[PDB]
Design a protein around this motif. Sequence first.
Motif, short mmCIF file in Angstrom:
data_model
loop_
_atom_site.label_atom_id
_atom_site.label_comp_id
_atom_site.label_asym_id
_atom_site.label_seq_id
_atom_site.Cartn_x
_atom_site.Cartn_y
_atom_site.Cartn_z
N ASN A 10 0.97 -1.36 -0.03
CA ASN A 10 0.04 0.04 0.01
C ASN A 10 0.83 1.34 0.14
O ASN A 10 0.42 2.11 -0.73
CB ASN A 10 -0.99 -0.09 1.19
CG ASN A 10 -2.01 -1.18 0.76
OD1 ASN A 10 -2.57 -1.20 -0.07
ND2 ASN A 10 -2.35 -1.79 1.89
N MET A 11 1.63 1.36 0.86
CA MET A 11 2.67 2.46 0.95
C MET A 11 3.55 2.52 -0.66
O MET A 11 3.69 3.73 -0.95
CB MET A 11 3.76 2.61 2.03
CG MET A 11 2.66 2.68 3.39
SD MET A 11 2.04 4.68 3.44
CE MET A 11 3.61 5.57 3.66
N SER A 31 8.82 -8.60 -2.81
CA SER A 31 9.61 -9.56 -1.58
C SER A 31 10.20 -10.84 -2.64
O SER A 31 11.39 -11.45 -2.10
CB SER A 31 8.80 -10.02 -0.47
OG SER A 31 7.71 -11.01 -1.05
N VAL A 46 8.84 -1.33 3.05
CA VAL A 46 8.83 -2.51 3.40
C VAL A 46 8.58 -2.39 5.09
O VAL A 46 8.97 -1.50 5.76
CB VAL A 46 9.97 -3.35 3.38
CG1 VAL A 46 10.37 -3.63 1.51
CG2 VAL A 46 11.37 -2.56 4.19
N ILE A 70 10.60 4.74 5.51
CA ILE A 70 9.18 5.16 5.84
C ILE A 70 8.78 4.46 7.13
O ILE A 70 7.24 4.59 7.40
CB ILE A 70 8.27 4.89 4.66
CG1 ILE A 70 7.88 3.55 4.39
CG2 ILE A 70 8.92 5.23 3.46
CD1 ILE A 70 7.10 3.27 3.26
N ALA A 112 -1.30 5.59 4.00
CA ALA A 112 -1.23 5.60 2.40
C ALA A 112 -2.58 6.02 1.85
O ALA A 112 -2.06 6.35 0.64
CB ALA A 112 -1.30 3.91 2.22
N1 LIG Z 1 -0.09 1.91 5.66
C1 LIG Z 1 0.29 2.76 5.98
O1 LIG Z 1 -0.69 3.65 6.12
C2 LIG Z 1 1.67 3.40 6.66
C3 LIG Z 1 1.78 4.78 6.75
C4 LIG Z 1 3.23 5.20 7.36
C5 LIG Z 1 4.09 4.43 7.22
N2 LIG Z 1 3.88 2.92 6.89
C6 LIG Z 1 5.16 2.00 6.97
O2 LIG Z 1 5.22 1.62 5.62
C7 LIG Z 1 5.69 0.27 5.31
C8 LIG Z 1 5.02 -0.39 4.33
O3 LIG Z 1 3.74 -0.50 4.98
P1 LIG Z 1 2.56 -0.94 3.90
O4 LIG Z 1 1.26 -0.60 4.48
O5 LIG Z 1 2.77 -0.67 2.63
O6 LIG Z 1 2.43 -2.44 3.87
P2 LIG Z 1 1.95 -3.72 2.74
O7 LIG Z 1 1.10 -2.97 2.26
O8 LIG Z 1 2.43 -5.29 3.27
O9 LIG Z 1 3.45 -3.47 1.96
C9 LIG Z 1 4.73 -4.06 2.62
C10 LIG Z 1 5.32 -4.63 1.22
O10 LIG Z 1 6.70 -4.81 1.47
C11 LIG Z 1 6.86 -6.05 0.86
N3 LIG Z 1 8.11 -6.51 1.35
C12 LIG Z 1 8.67 -7.37 2.61
N4 LIG Z 1 10.02 -7.66 2.35
C13 LIG Z 1 10.44 -6.87 1.05
C14 LIG Z 1 11.83 -6.94 0.46
N5 LIG Z 1 12.74 -7.56 1.14
N6 LIG Z 1 11.83 -6.53 -0.60
C15 LIG Z 1 10.78 -5.90 -1.42
N7 LIG Z 1 9.59 -6.13 -0.81
C16 LIG Z 1 9.47 -6.34 0.52
C17 LIG Z 1 5.75 -7.04 1.28
O11 LIG Z 1 5.63 -8.22 0.28
P3 LIG Z 1 5.00 -9.40 0.61
O12 LIG Z 1 3.53 -9.37 0.84
O13 LIG Z 1 5.31 -10.43 -0.98
O14 LIG Z 1 5.60 -10.09 1.76
C18 LIG Z 1 4.55 -6.20 1.27
O15 LIG Z 1 3.71 -6.14 0.22
C19 LIG Z 1 5.83 -0.07 6.83
O16 LIG Z 1 7.21 -0.17 7.50
C20 LIG Z 1 5.06 0.62 7.73
O17 LIG Z 1 5.04 0.93 9.13
C21 LIG Z 1 2.82 2.45 6.78
#
Ligand SMILES: NC(=O)c1ccc[n+]([C@@H]2O[C@H](COP(=O)([O-])OP(=O)(O)OC[C@H]3O[C@@H](n4cnc5c(N)ncnc54)[C@H](OP(=O)(O)O)[C@@H]3O)[C@@H](O)[C@H]2O)c1
Lengths: 190, 207
Positions: A10-11, A31, A46, A70, A112
């Motif tokens: 999502n991010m 990933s 991530v 992030i 996000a």
């Molecule tokens: N969501 C928000 O509103 C929000 C706001 C601010 C900050 N954040 C931060 O943003 C980061 C991402 O959050 P998100 O909401 O995007 O989570 P998400 O939707 O689950 O996306 C994270 C992605 O990172 C991937 N990933 C894990 N290890 C990786 C690697 N080694 N290389 C490339 N990709 C990898 C995962 O892939 P797989 O599914 O295939 O494992 C997953 O799809 C987190 O650290 C979170 O704390 C989130």
Amino acid sequence: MEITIFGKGNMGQAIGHNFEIAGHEVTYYGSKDQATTLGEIVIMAVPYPALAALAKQYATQLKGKIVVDITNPLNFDTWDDLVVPADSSAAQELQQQLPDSQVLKAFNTTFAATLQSGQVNGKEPTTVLVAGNDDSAKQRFTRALADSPLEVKDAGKLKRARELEAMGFMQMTLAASEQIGWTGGFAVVK
Amino acid sequence: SDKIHHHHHHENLYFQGMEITIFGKGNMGQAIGHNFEIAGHEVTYYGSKDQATTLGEIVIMAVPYPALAALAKQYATQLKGKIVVDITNPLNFDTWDDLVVPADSSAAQELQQQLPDSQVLKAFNTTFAATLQSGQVNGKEPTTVLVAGNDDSAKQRFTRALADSPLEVKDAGKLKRARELEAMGFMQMTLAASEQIGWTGGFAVVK
Ligand SMILES: NC(=O)c1ccc[n+]([C@@H]2O[C@H](COP(=O)([O-])OP(=O)(O)OC[C@H]3O[C@@H](n4cnc5c(N)ncnc54)[C@H](OP(=O)(O)O)[C@@H]3O)[C@@H](O)[C@H]2O)c1
């Protein structure tokens, strides 16, 4: 310029959307994907537990790059602490791990949906708070988002990533308790 | 009807409000008291060196961080069973680059340790004085108080005391969350200091 985003979630998608709007070429790696070359700006979109292993994997390619952390390093078992030292931050950790990279803390305070839409629940423009030691790195990052709908403000040196992470944690606990929603949050009003 | 006033968000009904004491007659103390006044409560103000002849149900400590311990000591017995609100952003003003309380703690947690029989809350540290005076974040969004504290009933009573004001009030969690509130207050202050925002704006809390 070339923007590399690790994380197709999502991010990663929301962040990439804004760099694409601004006219940049954005490359995404999930990933199960491997990167052969990295752009000038690299977004680490991530989970925190994946960050150090990813930084190790691309240790060589990350030298001389703007690397954007992030993460909100919460203890997700308790939701009552962060998992980095109380006087530090995940970004400070990353900057020690990547001494030849100019690490920025950015996007951790913007949910996000606010990045996708460019607004804080349709009411105010979304604002990125960017912390980092090198002003030139912050300037290049800020310039890269000039033609996006996002506002960008300099949050100070990388030491300020502590305050940014505290804010991200507070924002999440407020949304979790349903007192705000996940398409809203903290709007930065001049 | 000496202390009986209208309560704007209870259909303008006319009844006795609460007794509120505010320590500190500065920009924050006056803006905080303003809201308790328009909410229909009885507000008494004292500078930190003034003699508090009366102490209400809610006591606001709108004084510099170094003054908190001294006030708490002078009135400790008298503050038993009362809601005590720490509004401080405990900056190192010499550097503007640090706080003067431990990195894993907060001024409010220190105050709660000093006043174990008081219900210590952290509130108002994230709201600039102008946003409390106007009730809005530079005329764009309603101002929101984030209140942290251990006693849910105390947070509810505090929230009820502001219900007739223009302010939104949200529960920021237990008193341990004062660490994150202080971090946010610090960040807000540095953004205003750098002129990236002004002192009548800041962080608007949007649902
Ligand atoms: N969501 C928000 O509103 C929000 C706001 C601010 C900050 N954040 C931060 O943003 C980061 C991402 O959050 P998100 O909401 O995007 O989570 P998400 O939707 O689950 O996306 C994270 C992605 O990172 C991937 N990933 C894990 N290890 C990786 C690697 N080694 N290389 C490339 N990709 C990898 C995962 O892939 P797989 O599914 O295939 O494992 C997953 O799809 C987190 O650290 C979170 O704390 C989130």
